[PDB]
Swiss-Prot record:
The protein's name: Alpha-conotoxin GID
Record note on what altering residue 3 to N does: Loss in inhibitory potency on alpha-4-beta-2/CHRNA4-CHRNB2 and loss in inhibitory potency on alpha-3-beta-2/CHRNA3-CHRNB2
Top-level taxonomic group: Eukaryota
Organism: Conus geographus (Geography cone)
Ranges where the record places region N-terminal tail important for activity on alpha-3-beta-2/CHRNA3-CHRNB2 and alpha-4-beta-2/CHRNA4-CHRNB2 nAChR: 1-4
Tissue-wise expression: Expressed by the venom duct.
């Protein structure tokens, strides 16, 4: 997971409730 996960569209991708 990225430390910029909420900025990161790629983390965002599967993780929209992460932030």
């Amino acid at each position: 997971i990225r430390d910029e996960c909420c900025s990161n569209p790629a983390c965002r991708y599967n993780n929209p409730h992460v932030c």
